């Protein structure tokens, strides 16, 4: 991992999630649930998709071979012709094999960056109102539930609304 997220501090992935590539798993007083982020998973579909089409488009024009005949006193030009055609075929074989290798790697790290960007988005909202266990998960100091969930997600998260409750629960452990 180039970003430490996937197979880093969120070791293992979720067979449970099916709706998409990146998402959440909550746990409240109501119950459980895997939930796939949509806004992030979609911009990763739009990206990877534009990638495949541009890989293909930059390959739509490249060298095409055509059969030629040469007689037995034209060995020199014949060979020149063989070299030229093998030459371009080797050049475009290098070009495609390398493009795929280079973008394959960028694709994986792109995912790793998307996971870390989602985690950080949650973390930067909650702040002191919860604890980072270091496993891709936060323990809420205050109480969160099946509409407090849909608040961190869509970014619509009124922090002062829960700010005070958490502060006492937090310091209760100390004193």
């Amino acid at each position: 991992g180039l970003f430490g997220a996937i197979a880093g501090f969120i070791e293992g992935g979720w067979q449970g999630m099916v709706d998409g590539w990146y998402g959440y798993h909550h746990s409240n007083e109501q119950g459980s649930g895997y939930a796939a982020d949509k806004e992030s998973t979609q911009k990763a579909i739009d990206g990877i998709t534009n990638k495949i089409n541009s890989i293909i488009d930059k390959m739509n024009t490249q060298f095409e071979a055509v059969g030629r005949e040469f007689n037995n006193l034209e060995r020199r030009i014949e060979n020149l012709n063989k070299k030229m055609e093998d030459g371009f075929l080797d050049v475009w074989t290098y070009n495609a094999e390398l493009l795929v290798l280079m973008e394959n790697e960028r694709t994986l790290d792109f995912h790793d960056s998307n996971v870390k960007n989602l985690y950080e988005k949650v973390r930067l909202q909650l702040r002191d109102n919860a604890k980072e266990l270091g496993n891709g998960c936060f323990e809420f100091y205050h109480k969160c539930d099946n509409e407090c969930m849909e608040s961190v997600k869509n970014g619509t998260y009124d922090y002062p609304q829960y700010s005070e409750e958490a502060r006492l629960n937090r310091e209760e452990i100390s004193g």
Binding site: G1, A5, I6, A7, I10, G12, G13, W14, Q15, M17, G20, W21, Y22, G23, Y24, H25, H26, S27, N28, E29, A36, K51, I52, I55, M59, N60, Q62, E64, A65, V66, G67, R68, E69, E74, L89, W92, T93, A96, E97, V100, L101, M102, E103, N104, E105, T107, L108, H111, D112, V115, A130, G136, C137, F138, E139, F140, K143, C144, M149, V152
Partner: protein, 323 residues
């Protein structure tokens, strides 16, 4: 005591799909897209609408000149591409050379519609024999000759000077072929043509050719020691071809009207016709694919993917799938 939780995580499945990277090979992944096409129908199909010309055991020369072992092709007209064998057995039945043969074949790969037309009928040759014939160009174990060019020999015991022309009254380029015969000695020369020191002349608005037989002792080919050299030109609309000869002239009878030019190819293949259809043909099989790449053969014709030499090309689309 433990309370509420929210997790951040990522998709996983039961995919064995693998992709490659510069720093690590065989990385297992959730989703991947293969982009290399690796299969063909092993058949020689029509190309869109159009049937190919499949020359079987004939060569282009054997076809155009009318080798008796090729009467099947006496009347081809429209083809999508041409298939010829690596080493076809029926070509110049009478031994010799076809001048500028590869240039002609190349021309031929830009043409897909021939209309054979009679340019000089045998009936013209009232004072020469038209029945020059040979065992090397035999049909059913009795001696014959090229169906398209005619071997003139002396009538009675005289061979009068020939002087015939043809004007291209069409709006299509015309392919005309002719030839000359190299005898083995002066006796043989006299026996066939009476006249002893001969020439063949051919003139158009651009061609100014003079040929002369070359006596010499040669090794036998198909039992024969004589030789025949063939030539071709393109006669343009409203131009006139002029032949003069006092012996050894192998005259044109038929010529070929070029009615349609298009993209085409002469492919080398041992395969037969497959009675099938495709949009993309290679010498070893047709391709039916939406892949952007393929790896089956570099010589293709039609709307095709891009040839690469790779045995594998697959893009990662999804993410690293942990065990």
């Amino acid at each position: 005591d433990p309370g509420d939780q929210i997790c951040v995580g990522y998709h996983a499945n039961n995919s064995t799909e693998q992709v490659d990277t510069i720093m690590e090979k065989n990385i297992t992944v959730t989703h991947a897209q293969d982009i290399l096409e690796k299969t063909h129908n092993g058949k020689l199909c029509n190309l869109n609408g159009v049937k190919p010309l499949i020359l079987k055991d004939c060569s282009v020369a054997g076809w155009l000149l009318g080798n008796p072992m090729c009467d099947e092709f006496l009347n081809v007209s429209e083809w999508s591409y041409i298939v010829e064998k690596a080493s076809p057995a029926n070509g110049l039945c009478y031994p010799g050379d076809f001048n500028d043969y590869e240039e002609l074949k190349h021309l031929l790969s830009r043409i897909n519609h021939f209309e054979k037309i009679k340019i000089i009928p045998k009936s013209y040759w009232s004072n020469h024999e038209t029945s020059g014939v040979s065992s090397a160009c035999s049909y059913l174990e009795n001696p014959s000759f090229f169906r398209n060019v005619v071997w003139l020999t002396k009538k009675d015991n005289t061979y009068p000077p020939i002087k015939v022309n043809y004007t291209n009254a069409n709006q299509k380029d015309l392919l005309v072929l002719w030839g000359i015969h190299h005898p083995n000695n002066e006796a043989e020369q006299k026996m066939i043509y009476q006249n002893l020191n001969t020439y063949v002349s051919v003139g158009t608005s651009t061609l100014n050719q003079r040929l002369v037989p070359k006596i010499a002792t040669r090794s036998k080919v198909k039992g024969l020691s004589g030789r025949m050299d063939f030539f071709w030109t393109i006669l343009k609309p409203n131009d006139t071809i002029n032949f003069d000869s006092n012996g050894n002239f192998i005259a044109p009878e038929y010529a070929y009207k070029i009615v349609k030019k298009g993209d085409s190819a002469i492919m080398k293949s041992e395969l037969e016709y497959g009675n099938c259809n495709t949009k993309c043909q290679t010498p070893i099989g047709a391709i039916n694919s939406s892949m952007p790449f393929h790896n089956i053969h570099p010589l293709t014709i039609g709307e095709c993917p891009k040839y690469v030499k790779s045995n594998r090309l697959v893009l990662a689309t999804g993410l690293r799938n942990a065990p």
